[PDB]
Write a protein that binds this ligand. Structure first.
Ligand SMILES: Cn1ncc(C(=O)N2CCOCC2)c1C(=O)Nc1cc2nc(-c3ccccc3)cn2cc1C#N
Ligand SMILES: [Mg+2]
Ligand SMILES: [Zn+2]
Length: 313
């Protein structure tokens, strides 16, 4: 009860900012996550013994892949923490509980390959789940870990609150399927413009929570340029490995995944910021004004990629 987590002074201050980097010390990441749960939700939301045992089980079930790893999980949870803390009153007690856990779990047991590669490989998960393949697997892995003896951090909820939180987590994890983001943001754009957007409408909250997940998932583009740039190396390290595997199946990969087309990466990043990142944080800032520092950090990083193209770096 009376046991808070405290961070060193630099982390204590910088963790509140959207652009915070969780640092290279793996052993501090669980404490960082616990700290965020305590300030975001309360010292009471979760039994510390159960929470700690859930975090270490989730960590264990992330693989040693260049990008879709335990550091990504905690990074994405931190961005969600920053959105929730800057939008205090807009979110229920349950949503704050569910969304930090959703973020921590959203890439559980990722192998470093896209849904496309699973399908073309004919991976068993592609038979079990025809769309949002990895994302249905991540939610499946989340429910499995929650059901390990001593791991049910939600045990103190009523049957109905329990079903509500697992439903928030499921929609939230599915929403991290980027193929669904485009349509989700279009509908949110229409609803905000025509003025029909209603945060009491559960189907409208769903869409908004979905956009928050896309925004947290893509948050490497909202960091200081050196974080953004070094994370991009890890992203391409997975992409190019998948391209290699595509070539093994006798399929020429898309240029994104062809290490032979490294040259075109800066232009590929412009497409990404314009097609995906900028629209995401724009609609998000329209709906949740205090998330504007994400849009501003994203535009700064678009500007940095433009400077790479122009040979200036
Ligand atoms: C920064 N960032 N953060 C998240 C993601 C991302 O998408 N994730 C989905 C999957 O998991 C990893 C996170 C990216 C990203 O870089 N995305 C893209 C890069 C890219 N390069 C080229 C390109 C590169 C070279 C040549 C031609 C095209 C195309 N192209 C499309 C992209 C998209 N979308
Ligand atoms: Mg994912
Ligand atoms: Zn992710």
């Amino acid at each position: 009860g009376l046991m808070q987590f405290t961070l060193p002074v630099r982390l204590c201050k910088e963790i509140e900012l959207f652009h915070f980097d969780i640092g290279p010390f793996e052993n501090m990441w669980p404490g960082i996550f616990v700290y965020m749960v305590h300030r975001s939700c309360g010292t009471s939301c979760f039994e510390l013994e159960k929470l700690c045992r859930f975090i270490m089980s989730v960590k264990k079930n992330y693989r040693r892949v260049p990008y879709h790893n335990w550091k990504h999980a905690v990074t994405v949870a931190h961005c969600m923490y920053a959105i929730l803390q800057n939008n205090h009153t807009l979110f229920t007690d349950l949503e704050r509980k569910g969304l930090l856990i959703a973020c921590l779990c959203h890439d559980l047991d990722h192998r470093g390959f896209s849904n496309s590669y699973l399908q073309k490989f004919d991976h068993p998960l592609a038979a079990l789940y025809s769309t949002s393949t990895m994302e249905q697997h991540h939610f499946s892995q989340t429910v499995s870990i929650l059901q390990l003896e001593g791991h049910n951090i939600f045990s103190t909820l009523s049957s109905s609150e329990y079903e509500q939180v697992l439903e928030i987590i499921r929609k939230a994890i599915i929403a991290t399927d980027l193929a669904l983001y485009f349509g989700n943001r279009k509908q949110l754009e229409e609803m905000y413009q025509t003025g029909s957007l209603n945060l009491n409408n559960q189907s409208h909250r769903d869409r908004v929570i979905g956009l928050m997940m896309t925004a947290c998932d893509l948050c490497s583009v909202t960091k200081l340029w050196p974080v953004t740039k070094l994370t991009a190396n890890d992203i391409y390290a997975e992409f190019w490995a998948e391209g290699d595997e595509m070539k093994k199946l006798g399929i020429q990969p898309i240029p994104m995944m062809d290490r032979d087309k490294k040259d075109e990466v800066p232009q590929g990043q412009l497409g990404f910021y314009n097609a995906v990142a900028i629209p995401c944080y724009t609609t998000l800032t329209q709906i949740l004004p205090p998330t504007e520092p994400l849009l501003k950090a994203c535009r700064d990083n678009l500007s940095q990629w433009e400077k790479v193209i122009r040979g200036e770096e």
